[PDB]
Amino acid sequence: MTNQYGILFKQEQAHDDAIWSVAWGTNKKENSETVVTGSLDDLVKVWKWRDERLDLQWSLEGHQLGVVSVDISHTLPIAASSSLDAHIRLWDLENGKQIKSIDAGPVDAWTLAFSPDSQYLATGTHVGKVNIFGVESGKKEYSLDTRGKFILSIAYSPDGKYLASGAIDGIINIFDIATGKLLHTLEGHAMPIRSLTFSPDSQLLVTASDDGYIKIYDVQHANLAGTLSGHASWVLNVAFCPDDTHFVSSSSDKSVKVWDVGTRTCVHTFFDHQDQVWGVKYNGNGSKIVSVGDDQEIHIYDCPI
Amino acid sequence: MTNQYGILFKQEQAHDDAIWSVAWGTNKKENSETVVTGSLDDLVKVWKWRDERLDLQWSLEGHQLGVVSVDISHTLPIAASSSLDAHIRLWDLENGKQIKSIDAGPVDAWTLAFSPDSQYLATGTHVGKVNIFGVESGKKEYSLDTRGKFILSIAYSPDGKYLASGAIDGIINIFDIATGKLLHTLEGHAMPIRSLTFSPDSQLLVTASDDGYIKIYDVQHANLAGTLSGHASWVLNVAFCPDDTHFVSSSSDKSVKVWDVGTRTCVHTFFDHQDQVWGVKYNGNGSKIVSVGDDQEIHIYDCPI
Amino acid sequence: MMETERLVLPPPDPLDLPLRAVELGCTGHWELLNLPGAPESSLPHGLPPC
Amino acid sequence: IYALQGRSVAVQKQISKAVHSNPGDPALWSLLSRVVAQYAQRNAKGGVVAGNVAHILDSNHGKKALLYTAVNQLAMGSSSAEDEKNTALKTIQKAALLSPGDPAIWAGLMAACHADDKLALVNNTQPKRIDLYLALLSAVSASIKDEKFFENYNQSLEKWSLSQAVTGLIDTGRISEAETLCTKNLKSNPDQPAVILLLRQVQCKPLLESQKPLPDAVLEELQKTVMSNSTSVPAWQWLAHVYQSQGMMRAAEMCYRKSLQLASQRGSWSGKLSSLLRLALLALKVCMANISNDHWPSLVQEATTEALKLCFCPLAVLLQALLQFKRKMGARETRRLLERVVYQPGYPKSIASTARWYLLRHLYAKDDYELIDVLVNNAKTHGDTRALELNQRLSSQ
């Protein structure tokens, strides 16, 4: 019996307005399957995947303008969220109690990503800095900087000693986190990036563009070893699966395509999300897919191993 | 092929906030070299460059808000300052104590300038006029009138008999002090001017508007002799050298350039400030430059004769 | 408008403190002054139209 | 388009969406700051951040972005670390230096000066920056004269500036100058029922500053004058203060209630809390005199409940503490509530000191020396002069 990718769920009104960030954490080995979402309404909602559905755990708040990025930590149960007022919160994930509130000046932080051991929480900056705030202990441990434009999207390598930083002009800079020495700068595109993703066993780096193209690069060089041209309009987010077999992409043309690295073609395409999709993610394995659109819908698709 | 330009002194934190104007006066017949600066405070600190450094001498204050213009005199020991405080209190410079106080709001005074014989202290008003007060002799003998807009810059030709006035929207008015009759109104730039200066012997008038250009007009006619464009942001002050060969301009792009009028080119650029540079002046026999900036610092340069 | 008058003891207790309520800003932020007098809010006429 | 429908929350959300799409474009950030200043001014902190970001990303948008961020800081209050060089006054001053042409910056200067006066008064050190209101008003009028047409907006700006100048003159104490200004203004043009209220306020300041009895003619005149210019909660709250001054409390309560209804119908939010807290203060203070006709505690209860329904007003919880302490002074509930007020953080200094003081009095009533020394060290770990001195004087009578 063929196990085809199935819609398998739709959630009609997750938030009161558009949804912008989704994180899926199989942090707890028990029935946690924590899903966290930020949605421009100054609310961060914690959901759980109980048997076949999402039941809200709680909605927790304190945010001035819309929320821009959320992230969930694998090692410890802990969440982190940044908004438009450059103000970062850390969430307990057991009481919703805001352990710490890292402030920030007018230009410090745009997006977030944890360290594999949940210690550094690298973040972008409107004027090019990639300064790092040590988790739970320190503030502005150091500031790795270049000369350049806005940095929308930031990627972090899984193993370490890599930190990829997209830019508004469309250029990528990769810095090794060990010391901060810029390895080499990739020209990238002539339009913004909005998403950067590495791979598990991180040797391949995939970049999403604002012109609809997707570029595959090899970490050892600046070899543009791939280019994908299926999405009509912009592409906003790209995520992999725990094996280097396929990734999900969520254009701004209301289409989510699941591409494959081996053949670099769209193996399957989904047609939902009446308005444009802003986030996509994978669960603790390759099985399940989460997509969040501008319309207030959470979607969980299936993708057998 | 250029001379040896370079810093001599660097005051680390002169005031507690931005420094908005500066005046250098070799007032006494011997080598006194007193530098007076006003800031975003009440502070009007009076420094003295004795041999190799600035040592604070007076810290006099009577103001409530930030000082927008300061001035010094070459004949008497005296100084004047205006602020958003609606007051023109003029100091003594010998015991560090106030001499007088004139009530005048942004409709009666914006920026100061002493007379060639340091006797009248004309200022530029809001409704378009230029008001000429009398130091040590009262208030408001007479006001020249130009049917225009807010007036920002006031300059006196070194020999007297000429007064120039820039305005918001660009137009420039040249009066002759002898009769008080408008000689001619140049149109200059199309946005506010906020700095003007004659040349020694008063045959060359240098403007600096908000768009980056530096017109070089010619007095006794309306001829312009060229446009100096080398900045990348607003131009905030221009000071003309004691010998009629160079002049210094400070821009809002954190850079102090030194031009020469013979070839209309930039000889040397100083890249030493870290924020907007609000004030530049020469000294006596012009061989040093003072540059006060938005960051609290006082640079003194070396332009050998 | 029914009573038209009230007589009260102005120094009721010399131990206790009179309450002076000062209002700061449009977003709710109040403080308590010591000396007795009018309520004396800040920005009495509201925010200036910008 | 969204604002036409009166939605008034979607608007800010929509502009935030647009800025998220295109994180550059200083203009977009500046517009977000302006809308937050105008619509939904409860995200003041976000607005301040947005204005600062707009100012950073260029120089030529300095003008409007600095104006909007200064106004947002004004709306915020004094929610800072008492840090120099980043208060409202400094930023509005910076904007005034950038473009001294529009009248909004001058009005912002007026507001910043008044707010600084009030903050210094709170710290109770000195009123400063005393007499500049007349010059700024002249500047505002001169600047407005050269604006082509935003007629309604220009009228609003000039009217607000005039009112603010008169109030400032009243505050500093130069009654005569305010009087001459108002007289000249009314002699200029036919009467408008707003300025006459200002003339009433300036008139009635000497009188009622010293205890005196007033004739019913003036009081009825004042009430009619307030009715002339209705739909303005400030005026009504001031009238209620007048009632308290002479002392007709229930009438003051009614005036506050009318202001509350007016504020609630308008959809405003600050005015409603101001009216509720003021009414609660009136009832509790009148109760302080230990008066009969036990209805004022009920009014205190309802007002405080409404206040907590809206928001997290510390004054409301302290007010409940005082109501409980005064009526049925008691042993346990009052001490527990007072200690709860004075022990969890996130509370203003004055509230903590007052609650600490009353808890100290109750604890001295029911002697327990260990807790008393605990209170003494609590005072020590903060800055206080009054609790410890009173405890020392009355520990050995």
Curated annotation (Swiss-Prot), chains A, B:
In which ranges do the WD repeats occur?
Answer: 14-57, 62-101, 104-143, 146-187, 188-227, 230-269, 272-305
Which residues does this entry mark as bearing N-acetylthreonine? 2
| Main location group | nucleus
**What InterPro entries does the database record attribute to this sequence?**
G-protein_beta_WD-40_rep, SKI8, WD40/YVTN_repeat-like_dom_sf, WD40_repeat_CS, WD40_repeat_dom_sf, WD40_rpt
What protein does this entry describe? Superkiller complex protein 8
* Pfam families (UniProt xref): WD40 (PF00400)
The record's comment on protein family reads: Belongs to the SKI8 family.
Q: Name one GO biological process term.
A: Wnt signaling pathway
GO terms for cellular component: Cdc73/Paf1 complex; cytoplasm; cytosol; euchromatin; nucleoplasm; nucleus; Ski complex
Which positions does the record annotate as the modified residue N-acetylmethionine?
Answer: 1
Subunit structure, as described in the record: Component of the PAF1 complex, which consists of CDC73, PAF1, LEO1, CTR9, RTF1 and SKIC8. The PAF1 complex interacts with PHF5A. Within the PAF1 complex interacts directly with PHF5A. Component of the SKI complex which consists of SKIC2, SKIC3 and SKIC8.
Q: What does this protein do?
A: Component of the PAF1 complex (PAF1C) which has multiple functions during transcription by RNA polymerase II and is implicated in regulation of development and maintenance of embryonic stem cell pluripotency. PAF1C associates with RNA polymerase II through interaction with POLR2A CTD non-phosphorylated and 'Ser-2'- and 'Ser-5'-phosphorylated forms and is involved in transcriptional elongation, acting both independently and synergistically with TCEA1 and in cooperation with the DSIF complex and HTATSF1. PAF1C is required for transcription of Hox and Wnt target genes.
What CDD domains does the record point to?
A: WD40
Q: Which UniProt keywords apply?
A: Acetylation, Cytoplasm, Nucleus, Repeat, Transcription, Transcription regulation, WD repeat, Wnt signaling pathway
Compartments it resides in: Nucleus; Cytoplasm
UniProtKB/Swiss-Prot annotation, chain C:
Which disease is the protein involved in?
Trichohepatoenteric syndrome 2: A syndrome characterized by intrauterine growth retardation, severe diarrhea in infancy requiring total parenteral nutrition, facial dysmorphism, immunodeficiency, and hair abnormalities, mostly trichorrhexis nodosa. Hepatic involvement contributes to the poor prognosis of affected patients.
Coiled-coil spans are none
- By what name is this protein known? Superkiller complex protein 2
Family (UniProt) = Belongs to the helicase family. SKI2 subfamily.
Subunit-level organization:
Component of the SKI complex which consists of SKIC2, SKIC3 and SKIC8. Interacts with HBS1L isoform 2.
Question: Which positions form S-S bridges?
Answer: none
Compartments (UniProt record): Nucleus; Cytoplasm
Organism field: Homo sapiens (Human)
Full-protein residues shown: 1 to 50 of 1246
Task: Quote the function comment for this protein.
Answer: Helicase component of the SKI complex, a multiprotein complex that assists the RNA-degrading exosome during the mRNA decay and quality-control pathways. The SKI complex catalyzes mRNA extraction from 80S ribosomal complexes in the 3'-5' direction and channels mRNA to the cytosolic exosome for degradation. SKI-mediated extraction of mRNA from stalled ribosomes allow binding of the Pelota-HBS1L complex and subsequent ribosome disassembly by ABCE1 for ribosome recycling. In the nucleus, the SKI complex associates with transcriptionally active genes in a manner dependent on PAF1 complex (PAF1C).
Curated annotation (Swiss-Prot), chain D:
**Tissue expression as described in the entry:** Widely expressed with the highest levels observed in vascular tissues, lymph node, pituitary, lung and intestine. Not expressed in the liver.
The lineage's top-level taxon is Eukaryota
TM segment ranges = none
Effect seen on changing residue 103 to A: Found in a THES1 patient
Compartments (UniProt record):
Cytoplasm; Nucleus
Repeat region (TPR), residues: 159-192, 233-266
Known disease link = Trichohepatoenteric syndrome 1: A syndrome characterized by intrauterine growth retardation, severe diarrhea in infancy requiring total parenteral nutrition, facial dysmorphism, immunodeficiency, and hair abnormalities, mostly trichorrhexis nodosa. Hepatic involvement contributes to the poor prognosis of affected patients.
- Entry function: Component of the SKI complex, a multiprotein complex that assists the RNA-degrading exosome during the mRNA decay and quality-control pathways. The SKI complex catalyzes mRNA extraction from 80S ribosomal complexes in the 3'-5' direction and channels mRNA to the cytosolic exosome for degradation. SKI-mediated extraction of mRNA from stalled ribosomes allow binding of the Pelota-HBS1L complex and subsequent ribosome disassembly by ABCE1 for ribosome recycling. In the nucleus, the SKI complex associates with transcriptionally active genes in a manner dependent on PAF1 complex (PAF1C).
Its assembly, as annotated, is:
Component of the SKI complex which consists of SKIC2, SKIC3 and SKIC8. Interacts with PAF1.
Q: Which family does it belong to?
A: Belongs to the SKI3 family.
Protein name in UniProt: Superkiller complex protein 3
Q: Which organism is it from?
A: Homo sapiens
- UniProt lists the gene as SKIC3
